[PDB]
Amino acid sequence: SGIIEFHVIGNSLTPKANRRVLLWLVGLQNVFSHQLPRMPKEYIARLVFDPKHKTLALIKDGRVIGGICFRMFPTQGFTEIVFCAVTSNEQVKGYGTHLMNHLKEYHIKHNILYFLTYADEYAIGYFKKQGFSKDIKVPKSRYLGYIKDYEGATLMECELNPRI
Ligand SMILES: CCC(=O)SCCNC(=O)CCNC(=O)[C@H](O)C(C)(C)COP(=O)(O)OP(=O)(O)OC[C@H]1O[C@@H](n2cnc3c(N)ncnc32)[C@H](O)[C@@H]1OP(=O)(O)O
């Protein structure tokens, strides 16, 4: 291959069926754990391997270099962004943005035009660059008890424009 690849992966029932995917999920778990050191490792493991969660993985030379773990709520009309990370040495090259753009294109194709996420204070500017806002248009009745809340984090929303 020799080039970056985007793979939407996860655990559909059991992770043993596809070893390549398993290895990538472990890779993701490790990247998320390293780049989100305040999240418990067991918690990251649990969600990455949860059948209702998918992860858009960025793979370079068979190695996970970043990912966005998410959960789609089609009937609610949004997706929850759960974890978002690029490995350290590959940061500040445009990959965090590429990832999010890819994720947006994927969701436009699935007619889900809202992302919700809880952002750490020191990550807010990243989300803002990706078009997220603190102003939430998804009604609280729609996301309360659907999305996971976090301590001291700021709820942010991206309204996707499918046009162009
Ligand atoms: C909501 C769920 C969560 O995970 S909350 C926390 C978000 N994730 C993390 O904090 C994990 C640790 N951080 C990272 O992995 C990376 O810093 C992330 C956020 C993924 C960005 O990856 P990276 O590959 O460097 O992205 P990039 O090259 O496309 O550049 C990012 C562009 O956004 C801008 N930005 C503005 N404010 C911030 C900020 N507070 N942190 C990071 N980036 C920020 C950058 O300046 C950059 O824009 P530009 O290229 O200068 O125009």
Author numbering: 2 to 165
Text taken from the publication that reported this structure:
Gcn5 is a member of the GNAT (Gcn5-related N-acetyltransferase) family of histone acetyltransferases that acetylate the N-terminal tails of histones H3 and H2B at the promoters of inducible genes and are broadly implicated in transcriptional regulation. The active site of Gcn5 contains two grooves where acetyl-CoA and peptide bind, which intersect near the β-mercaptoethylamine moiety of coenzyme A and the target lysine. The ternary complex between Gcn5, acetyl-CoA and peptide forms through a fully ordered mechanism, as binding to acetyl-CoA brings about a structural rearrangement that widens the peptide-binding groove within the Gcn5 active site. Whereas Gcn5L2 robustly catalyzes lysine acetylation, the acyltransferase activity of Gcn5L2 becomes progressively weaker with increasing acyl-chain length.
To elucidate the structural basis for the ability of Gcn5L2 to discriminate among different acyl-CoA cofactors, we determined the structures of human Gcn5L2 bound to propionyl-CoA and butyryl-CoA to 2.0 and 2.1 Å resolution, respectively. We found that human Gcn5L2 efficiently acetylates and propionylates peptides, while its butyrylating activity is nearly undetectable. Based on these relative rate measurements, Gcn5L2 is unlikely to contribute significantly to lysine butyrylation in vivo but may be capable of catalyzing lysine propionylation under physiological conditions. We have determined crystal structures that describe how Gcn5 accommodates propionyl-CoA in its active site and provide a structural mechanism that explains our biochemical data showing that human Gcn5 discriminates between different acyl-CoA molecules. These structures reveal that the active site of Gcn5 can accommodate longer acyl chains without major structural rearrangements, but that the butyryl chain would sterically clash with an incoming lysine residue.
